[PDB]
């Protein structure tokens, strides 16, 4: 195949992490700006690639969640106002670096801090039929009126558990496939939204643990791609990493065909035979 075992190992490593000075600087500065307005009425935490340790690009943007939750976690008002107040708190400090986006407020970085997406949100509680329990996550609204929900804590914990059980290969395989995704996008071979990082993470999550072969990145990656590809042809019922909801739920526009096509492009790019 086209890339050596060592090249796959190199691609499997995290590139940006929460240890990075520029990441710490962004979190510190943004946290101070938000606390100046909201005090203890919010919980601030990370989600996305810095939280799950799946970054494969230098100087990656960080996703900082600001959960307005005074009603649920009190000190021992609609979403439009929350997001506007969040934007104001950030603009007072970061001025022209602040840009409102559809699902977040972006705070553009500089020589000393990474860019950050600040995600104002509320507590969400929803019943999971998969687990027959009420689950707690977050909810917010996009500027184009979609209700966006997430379970970042359960996503974090389940992904960490799987990597701990697979010789650390679960997240290493996610990272490799994210690298291939960016390369295919840069080459114009796939659209930049054929698959997202979240989608890749969920696809690999559903590959059984016994497909991850200690110390064999080439064969593990082969197993991962073949398993997802075949599962997509076979109409498989994949879960999200959070194990609370189905990946191919009728709430989500992404499809098994998207995953099948992505796996094919990865297989061809990597040169497996």
Binding site for Mg ion (CB under 5 A): 48-49, 63
Shortest Cβ distance from residue 226 to Mg ion (Å)?
Answer: 28
Dump strand ranges (E) for the chain: 42-47, 62-68, 98-100, 105-107, 116-128, 133-141, 147-150
Identify which of residues 198 and 262 has a Cβ nearer to Mg ion in the complex: 198
Identify which of residues 33 and 56 has a Cβ nearer to Mg ion in the complex: 56
Contact 86, 118 (CB under 8 A): yes
Contact 266, 177 (CB under 8 A): yes
Determine the residue with CB nearest Mg ion: 48
- Residues forming a β-bridge with 136: 125
Taking the CA atoms of residue 107, residue 108, residue 109 and residue 115 in that order, the dihedral angle to the nearest 10 degrees is: 70
Identify which of residues 49 and 223 has a Cβ nearer to Mg ion in the complex: 49
d(CA 58, CA 91): 26
For the chain, give the number of residues. 273
Shortest Cβ distance from residue 116 to Mg ion (Å)?
Answer: 10
Shortest Cβ distance from residue 198 to Mg ion (Å)?
Answer: 9
Identify which of residues 193 and 268 has a Cβ nearer to Mg ion in the complex: 193
Identify which of residues 63 and 201 has a Cβ nearer to Mg ion in the complex: 63
Residue 211 DSSP class: G
Identify which of residues 34 and 119 has a Cβ nearer to Mg ion in the complex: 119
Shortest Cβ distance from residue 55 to Mg ion (Å)?
Answer: 8
Of 179, 166, 168, 170, nearest to 7 by C-alpha is 179
Shortest Cβ distance from residue 111 to Mg ion (Å)?
Answer: 21
Shortest Cβ distance from residue 114 to Mg ion (Å)?
Answer: 11
Instruction: List CB contacts of 154: < 8 A, sequence separation 6 or more.
Output: 135, 137, 241, 242, 243, 244
């Amino acid at each position: 195949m086209n890339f050596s075992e060592q090249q796959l190992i190199n691609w499997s490593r995290p590139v940006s992490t929460t240890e990075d000075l520029k990441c710490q600087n962004a979190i510190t500065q943004i946290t101070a700006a938000l606390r100046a307005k909201f005090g203890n009425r919010v919980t601030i935490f990370l989600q996305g690639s810095y939280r799950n340790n799946t970054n494969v690009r230098q100087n990656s943007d960080v996703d900082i969640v600001m959960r307005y939750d005074d009603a649920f976690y009190p000190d021992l008002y609609n979403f439009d106002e929350l997001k506007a107040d969040t934007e104001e708190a950030l603009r007072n400090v970061f001025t022209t670096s602040v840009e409102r986006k559809n699902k977040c407020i972006q705070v553009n970085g500089n020589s000393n801090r990474i860019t950050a997406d600040v995600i104002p949100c509320f507590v969400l509680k929803r019943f999971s039929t998969l687990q027959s329990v009420e689950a707690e996550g977050i909810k917010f609204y996009s500027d184009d009126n979609k209700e966006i929900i997430s379970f970042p804590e359960q996503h974090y914990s389940n992904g960490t558990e799987k990597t701990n059980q697979t010789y650390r290969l679960y997240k290493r395989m996610v990272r490799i496939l994210k690298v291939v995704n960016y390369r295919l996008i840069d080459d114009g071979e796939i659209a930049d939204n054929l698959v997202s990082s979240f989608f890749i993470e969920c696809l690999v999550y559903n590959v059984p643990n016994n497909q991850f072969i200690s110390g064999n990145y080439t064969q593990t990656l082969r197993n991962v791609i073949v398993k997802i590809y075949e599962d997509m042809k076979n109409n498989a019922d994949y879960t999200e990493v959070n194990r609370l909801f189905w990946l191919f739920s009728n709430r989500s526009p992404r499809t098994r065909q998207d995953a099948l096509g992505f796996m094919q492009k990865c297989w061809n790019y990597l040169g497996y035979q």
